[PDB]
Design a protein around this ligand. Structure first.
Ligand SMILES: N[C@@H](Cc1c[nH]c[nH+]1)C(=O)O
Ligand SMILES: N[C@@H](Cc1c[nH]c[nH+]1)C(=O)O
Ligand SMILES: N[C@@H](Cc1c[nH]c[nH+]1)C(=O)O
Ligand SMILES: N[C@@H](Cc1c[nH]c[nH+]1)C(=O)O
Ligand SMILES: N[C@@H](Cc1c[nH]c[nH+]1)C(=O)O
Ligand SMILES: N[C@@H](Cc1c[nH]c[nH+]1)C(=O)O
Ligand SMILES: [Ba+2]
Ligand SMILES: [Ba+2]
Ligand SMILES: [Ba+2]
Ligand SMILES: [Ba+2]
Ligand SMILES: [Ba+2]
Ligand SMILES: [Ba+2]
Ligand SMILES: [Ba+2]
Ligand SMILES: [Ba+2]
Ligand SMILES: [Ba+2]
Ligand SMILES: [Ba+2]
Ligand SMILES: [Ba+2]
Ligand SMILES: [Ba+2]
Lengths: 147, 147, 147, 147, 147, 147
């Protein structure tokens, strides 16, 4: 049962979508026990988006730098988030398209039972379009995985 | 070029994610020229989710009841939104999973140039999990298409 | 190297597309050594579409009714043909859509060298759209496999 | 209701498959109201196949050069056409395959009602095989979208 | 670093493929620390293949009956295994195919470092073919996830 | 009906998995009438993996070096084998992942009736994970096709 106050998904998206506050929201979330990570990445290569998220997550401490387990949970949540952005073929430049994304990564227990342990959420928002500015529209993606 | 104040995607998601206001947000959006449609649908059949969205959209007037063109634009934006929720296989009950979604549909020009005309956005938020309550997590989806 | 006069794909289509009152193509192809099949199927169940094509291909003697080897060559040709039709998710009714198809099944060698042996093409044409007539547009798919 | 005499999909294919008439078929279709485009593309990069189809469409006046709306309709139609050719994975060279394609793009109204507006059809035809001539076979793809 | 002697994937397959020993291989693996599960499932519904694997896993104590965390790890591992069997579209009956599968589920740590924790491997083996015995062939699938 | 002693899939695996110091399987299979191939490949480019398998299958004489027909049977077997490995997106390096594979290619008839003719299996095994060693887990894939 998802805790009405700890919906890791909804929270990561609100953070990702609210431009006024930035450090005001991150602190509250962190004081609530959430490990937060924010970043931006524009590219026509998906592996750079994945790389960017993984690097920012490990630096901000959202996931462990050592070992595979946690990098593996993050990898798949990212894959699942890229689905919402790619909608069909997890390809960017190879299908003549590029993205400009903002991303958030949240870690913590979104459930009532403390036995559930930690979960992670990768949220993406920005644009996807042709190699030219202006010729694009919005795109969203959210992936949730257990750690 | 997307108008900083008319980002149809971001707006539909905020509406979808804000529980306090409900009719307070819809009115402002509608006074701004946006045609809005809200609804909920829980099911293990994707064709009922699609049906629910299409029916609510035509009743609330977001898209034209007559003709194919507009129903065709809505159909594909829905498909693109379901990708974010299904992340891989656009299947629910057949893969032993069910969803509980909240959906918003917005229509209007999100660009600076008035020549772009109308666009539509289908946003989904809720849960996806096993046929039992509690065993699920969050899921998001957003589709954007021109009309 | 393909035989400019035996491009099994191109031929199966020209045959599927033509709506001439006088039956002149089937006999011409057969006389040139080709096996030909023709059928129509409308359904919101992909398995029924695969079923019909198999059956008509066996009744017409395009593939052997005995064994698996040829039924296997056709099944994949059919599948690769349904991709052009479903474009992404090999689902019809569960995605609230339905088809009205016409199909051709051509079997024979399309190469200059007799060594390449027989090959088989499955072509599809019709409409795909909502459950209501009129609300739809065209759909095309060609699957080519070896036998 | 598709107009028996304006089946944009069927027409673009017949236009693509027939070698005898080249300007004779374009003219007749142009005089019938259709915007028409024809091209050839050989590549192992999907983005080049996409870019040529867009560039040819914008140079022949099948879709506007200015704005995003029309480029967006064509992009998706191309994607839907790319499906029938790739059959499963929208990759060519990365999967050790290359294509030699002939394409067509048709823009006009295929319905009885004028309220349906214009639609665009992207059609593809040619060979898909290994990076060696002769080692291949035929491949089709038809995409259809509303503008 | 995978531990040469604890390659959970390789083990579950060898365990799945060998008919001579049944309890002799389960015991040895159990005495080596591995949680093990074995089952058989014949169906044309993917959800039944999934449900049997989950039910068998929860009854044999390979994953907890309480909570979501472990069911979530197993669900995804099963999906990843379902991939190798469906090869492209996660559908069976809807695509006129049915399977007769033997499965295995292994839970334990395959790495040198104990900080990697437990991982779960779902393995599938059997036939996938038409709804008629004999008309089919072999099919494999191995899914691997972290708990 | 498959021959309990000639299940080409099951055999190709047992052969791929075994790491015995004494070469005893290859010769036994060959003596029973099977064509066998063995190779290893590590790369973050799927085309290089397909390349190697083709080549080793031609050098070993598992499929004819001349023609297309057999190269076509193998290419698809390979593809259907890569699905078990990529589980969703037939991408390695562009999704920031890489493989370390071992592959077997068995060719021969696996059915009781000699009428089914020859068939070919492509089996894969190794690891898939980040560009850094250790950060990975196992991966499996079996593709079976007719020839
Ligand atoms: N609209 C495309 C992106 C794009 C390519 N060209 C123009 N726009 C998408 O859905 O990703
Ligand atoms: N977690 C699954 C849903 C589910 C099935 N069983 C339990 N949960 C998903 O990503 O859709
Ligand atoms: N146009 C959709 C089908 C559809 C459903 N409703 C209307 N049309 C397709 O491309 O398959
Ligand atoms: N014919 C393959 C392509 C190929 C590459 N090499 C041989 N064939 C296809 O379906 O795309
Ligand atoms: N062998 C097919 C299934 C099938 C159905 N009928 C014949 N064959 C597959 O790859 O799934
Ligand atoms: N584990 C991923 C690959 C990966 C990338 N980084 C770490 N692992 C897979 O299933 O392919
Ligand atoms: Ba996909
Ligand atoms: Ba898919
Ligand atoms: Ba697919
Ligand atoms: Ba092929
Ligand atoms: Ba788009
Ligand atoms: Ba796909
Ligand atoms: Ba459509
Ligand atoms: Ba999940
Ligand atoms: Ba798929
Ligand atoms: Ba993994
Ligand atoms: Ba896929
Ligand atoms: Ba098969």
């Amino acid at each position: 049962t998802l805790h009405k106050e700890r919906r890791i998904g909804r929270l990561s998206v609100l953070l990702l979508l609210n431009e006024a506050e930035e450090s005001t929201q991150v602190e509250e979330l962190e004081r609530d026990g959430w490990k937060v990570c924010l970043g931006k990445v524009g590219s026509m290569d998906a592996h750079k988006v994945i790389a960017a998220i993984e690097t920012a997550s490990k630096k901000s401490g959202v996931i462990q730098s050592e070992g595979y387990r946690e990098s593996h949970a993050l990898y798949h949540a990212t894959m699942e988030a890229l689905h919402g952005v790619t909608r069909g073929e997890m390809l960017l430049g190879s299908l003549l398209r590029t993205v400009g994304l903002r991303f958030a990564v949240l870690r913590g227990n979104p459930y009532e039972s403390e036995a559930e342990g930690d979960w992670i959420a990768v949220s993406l928002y920005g644009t996807i379009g042709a190699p030219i500015k202006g010729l694009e529209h919005e795109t969203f993606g959210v992936g949730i995985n257990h750690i």
